[PDB]
Design an enzyme around this catalytic site. Structure first.
Site, short mmCIF file in Angstrom:
data_model
loop_
_atom_site.label_atom_id
_atom_site.label_comp_id
_atom_site.label_asym_id
_atom_site.label_seq_id
_atom_site.Cartn_x
_atom_site.Cartn_y
_atom_site.Cartn_z
N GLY A 254 76.33 54.04 -0.27
CA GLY A 254 76.79 53.52 1.00
C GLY A 254 77.90 54.47 1.39
O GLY A 254 77.89 55.61 0.92
N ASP B 224 80.01 54.21 12.82
CA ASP B 224 78.88 54.86 12.15
C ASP B 224 77.59 54.10 12.40
O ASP B 224 76.75 53.96 11.50
CB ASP B 224 79.12 55.01 10.65
CG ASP B 224 78.21 56.06 10.02
OD1 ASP B 224 77.60 56.84 10.78
OD2 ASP B 224 78.08 56.07 8.78
O1 LIG Z 1 70.03 53.58 2.71
C1 LIG Z 1 69.61 52.31 2.19
C2 LIG Z 1 70.40 52.01 0.92
N1 LIG Z 1 71.07 50.72 1.08
C3 LIG Z 1 72.40 50.55 1.23
C4 LIG Z 1 72.66 49.22 1.36
C5 LIG Z 1 74.04 48.72 1.53
C6 LIG Z 1 74.91 49.50 2.31
C7 LIG Z 1 76.21 49.11 2.50
C8 LIG Z 1 76.68 47.93 1.90
C9 LIG Z 1 75.83 47.16 1.12
C10 LIG Z 1 74.52 47.56 0.94
C11 LIG Z 1 76.58 45.96 0.60
C12 LIG Z 1 78.05 46.17 0.99
C13 LIG Z 1 78.03 47.33 1.96
N2 LIG Z 1 78.95 47.63 2.81
O2 LIG Z 1 80.28 47.20 2.61
C14 LIG Z 1 71.40 48.54 1.28
C15 LIG Z 1 71.09 47.10 1.35
C16 LIG Z 1 71.78 46.21 2.18
C17 LIG Z 1 71.41 44.88 2.19
N3 LIG Z 1 70.42 44.44 1.43
C18 LIG Z 1 69.73 45.24 0.63
C19 LIG Z 1 70.04 46.58 0.57
N4 LIG Z 1 70.47 49.46 1.11
#
Ligand SMILES: OCCn1cc(-c2ccc3c(c2)CC/C3=N\O)c(-c2ccncc2)n1
Ligand SMILES: OCCn1cc(-c2ccc3c(c2)CC/C3=N\O)c(-c2ccncc2)n1
Lengths: 283, 230, 223, 275
Positions: A19, A129
């Protein structure tokens, strides 16, 4: 102790990716959760302040189209924990599997993203972003705007950021880095314009170009803009006009999210209904 | 032969999902001439609703294929001829039910409940005939649908409370008539919203069984209003 | 009263309209044509008759169960029975149509082994379907012919076909439930089911995934 | 404070139903929202206590299976605002429209509900009115627990979900985590049964009287045939007459989740189907 989650309660699973300021894994905490974490023993004052800002921002987000923040942890390592979204990012669906979305579902995805950014801007939050990768589809039905690591509250002492590689959504003022606040509500509106471009063309902007570094320079210059001629024919005319409005080169002529939302809501009502009415069933 | 044996074999055909058999049994029961009971009424309704629904669904599928076939002139001819086979079946089913209504059900309806129920059934089957009628008899069938619907609507508002499930269902089907058949969304939303809002007021009033009966149709009215205003 | 192409088109159209009696009639004429069916035409005939006979099997089971649970009521029991035999007659006629088509056209005109194991399996399945409702004096005969055709196809099945192969995987499923249900030989049936599943795990992509789950459910519930 | 919504920002639409202490409408506020509003002209001191207590409980909830509180308003009249859920209540689908759910979907609903109240009890939240009417379906994909008007943080007419000790009310505060577990047992009864319990008794006072003594308990033989045996046992565990024989929600949630895994397609022998 407001949203802090004690150590030991969160079972962290498989590494799923990265992330903004950490790596993301799947976890178990009263069901499924996503965890963005920083794999370091000792956070520097800069990583700790960044994490503190993101928790402060997420603690003000309480909306269906914003990835639901569920808590934070400090103990082993600093970590933000959210709801789990089974599915993929809209970036994955559009450019990695070419999942055939109907134009109706594309309109709905844009409308839900607009609802999320309407909410954000009404609480004076700039995401800074917004991109198709930070849009996640829960159960391939609901949009969840996520990854608030570069977000801020609109304040006089705002911010100070690792812009890095994802620059397609960056507005010309953000590329030039020459005005008072390169990031603003209008920079978010231009990022939104690019995500509608992706939704309505099926591809990333400036896709068919020969060189890659100058591209920035050309966008910075004003020399290059998304090719609106690659929008598909079933994309409503109001939607193409609206994306042009969100992509206009000078910030002050771009629309605000209340009227972007109203326009997406109204034009979505003029598309042919896909279902039929329901009649009285058999008792 | 007996009316009760016919009702029981109708229930057994319902359990085996042989709706043509249930429909035949109930048609025999209604042709005896006596006013039907509430259970007998609902068994006849369920039977013919399934019998005609199979054809409505199949008709929609092959009709869609018919219009969406461009290049092939022979294939589009085949889809047209199969659509007319299904259409003929559809019409026969509806004409069977409308004959039953006119000859036995409507004339023998003593109570108001029964007469709104049967006039609404008449509106429904003429509406199913309207969904496939093309050009010449279309106007006549649409008018007969609206007329039966309208008479039942007036009697509903004059002897049935806004929460009564038969009146609520009449509202739902009449609004669907307005939306789908007359192509007038606004009048359809007006009728639907009025019935739903008038029921919501008095919803606190009802017993827990009456509430299940009423809410099942009110949720459909609000689903329709959500779809029509979106 | 039309071309094989016209009948196949009406069959596909009846399939999307879920009018399986029409699809069955179309494919019956197409097979009475005398030529070997293609994989698509084969598949359409299978879908058609399986749905036509499955509706009757479902109704038969429902009405038989109702017959069972009728206590202290002749006329209730009398109505359910007479209805069960009506469905039973339909059940027989359908299978007799399908078995006549199998014996007079399908198996004899099968060039490659795949086709003839498939049609013999279908042969076994429909005799099996007949099996479920057989009375007892003729029951024995029908069951005998069922396993005879089944095993004849079985002999050729794991001899020219790969362990991942679904016609093979399905034949086993039907032959195993033949032994378990029709007759009462769980050991043989269980022997067969676990044998086939493990040989499949050893060595269609989405098709086999679900037949192995049906095998794993079967053994889990049979033991 | 930071969850108050200025008046004028929320367009209240159609009146769609009732809640704990008010009437519920559909509204627009950065999209769709549900609005529970007390229409009283001048809130009496008990109504403001109920409303601020409910807001206080809801602002501590942040979970996918809890109806997401989004803000509150007081200006025109007092109002609680949540996310909008387009499907109806579980009670509606089970007993008014009899939506035929597959057993897989029923297990998933029970599983999600169990996650919601595991979260709730882990933050010391007692709901005290958990019933299928307070379980909302969001687009046939997510379960959402709602109406916390009767909820509390445990600090030092919906009778069919009330545990026997709650009926007796001989104790000063009969409500507890266990009472909630018994309500959950009743909701599982609805899911695996298709019906409400005690369908044969007609009057409400009779049923209160018999469950309080213990003469009456739900008839489990009315569970549908494809219901996994572990789920039936878990229902029995959550419904035991005596509170301390009931399991805790970490244990309920873990066994339903484990249980959700490995569920067969259908109950009896199966032949090849490609159609
Ligand atoms: O490029 C895709 C990779 N990927 C990144 C995330 C992700 C990205 C940012 C954040 C979180 C999860 C959690 C906290 C956060 N930001 O603070 C997820 C995802 C988000 C929700 N559910 C499942 C997966 N997939
Ligand atoms: O049961 C059918 C009637 N019905 C009642 C509600 C309801 C009930 C309580 C509460 C809220 C809404 C919101 C605030 C509240 N409790 O605090 C809903 C509903 C819930 C969520 N989305 C859409 C509708 N439908």
């Amino acid at each position: 102790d407001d949203w802090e989650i004690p150590d030991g309660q969160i079972t962290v699973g498989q590494r799923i990716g990265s992330g903004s300021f950490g790596t993301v894994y799947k976890g178990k905490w009263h069901g499924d959760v996503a965890v963005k974490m920083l794999n370091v023993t000792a956070p520097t004052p800069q990583q700790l302040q960044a994490f503190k800002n993101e928790v402060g921002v997420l603690r003000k987000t309480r909306h269906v189209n914003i990835l639901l923040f569920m808590g934070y942890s400090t103990k082993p390592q600093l970590a933000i924990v959210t709801q789990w979204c089974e599915g993929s990012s809209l970036y994955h669906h559009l450019h990695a599997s070419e999942t055939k979305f109907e134009m109706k579902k594309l309109i709905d995805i844009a409308r839900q993203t607009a609802r999320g950014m309407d909410y954000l801007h009404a609480k004076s939050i700039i995401h800074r972003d917004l991109k198709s990768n930070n849009i996640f589809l829960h159960e391939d039905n609901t949009v969840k705007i996520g990854d608030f690591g570069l977000a801020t509250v609109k304040s006089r002492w705002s911010g100070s950021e690792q812009l890095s590689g994802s620059i397609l959504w960056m507005a010309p003022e953000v590329i030039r880095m020459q005005d008072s606040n390169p990031y603003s509500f209008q920079s978010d509106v231009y990022a939104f314009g690019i995500v509608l471009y992706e939704l309505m063309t099926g591809q990333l902007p400036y896709s068919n170009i020969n060189n890659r570094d100058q591209i920035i320079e050309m966008v910075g210059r004003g020399s290059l803009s998304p090719d609106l001629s690659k929008v598909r024919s079933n994309c409503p005319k109001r939607m193409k006009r609206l994306m042009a409005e969100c992509l206009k080169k000078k910030r002050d002529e771009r629309p605000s999210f209340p009227r972007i939302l109203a326009e997406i809501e109204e034009l979505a009502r003029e598309l042919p209904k896909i279902h039929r009415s329901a009649s009285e069933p058999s008792l | 032969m007996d009316k009760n044996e016919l009702v029981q074999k109708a229930k057994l055909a319902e359990q085996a999902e042989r709706y043509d058999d249930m429909a035949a049994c109930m048609k025999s029961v209604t042709e005896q001439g006596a006013e039907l009971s509430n259970e007998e009424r609902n068994l006849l309704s369920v039977a013919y609703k399934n019998v005609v629904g199979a054809r409505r669904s199949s008709w929609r599928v092959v009709s869609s294929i018919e219009q969406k076939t461009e290049g092939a002139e022979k294939k589009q001819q085949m889809a047209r001829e199969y659509r007319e086979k299904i259409e003929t079946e559809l019409r026969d089913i509806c004409n069977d039910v409308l004959s039953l209504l006119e000859k036995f059900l409507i004339p023998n309806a003593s109570q108001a409940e029964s007469k709104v129920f049967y006039l609404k059934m008449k509106g429904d089957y003429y509406r199913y005939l309207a969904e496939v009628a093309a050009g010449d008899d279309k106007k006549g069938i649409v008018d007969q649908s609206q007329q039966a619907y309208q008479e039942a609507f007036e009697i509903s508002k004059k002897e049935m409370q806004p929460t009564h499930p038969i009146r609520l269902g009449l509202a739902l089907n009449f609004s669907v008539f307005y939306y789908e058949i007359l192509n007038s969304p606004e009048k359809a939303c007006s009728l639907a919203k009025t019935a739903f809002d008038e029921a919501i007021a008095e919803l606190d009033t009802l017993s827990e069984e009456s509430y299940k009966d009423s809410t099942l149709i009110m949720q459909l009215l609000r689903d329709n209003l959500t779809l029509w205003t979106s």
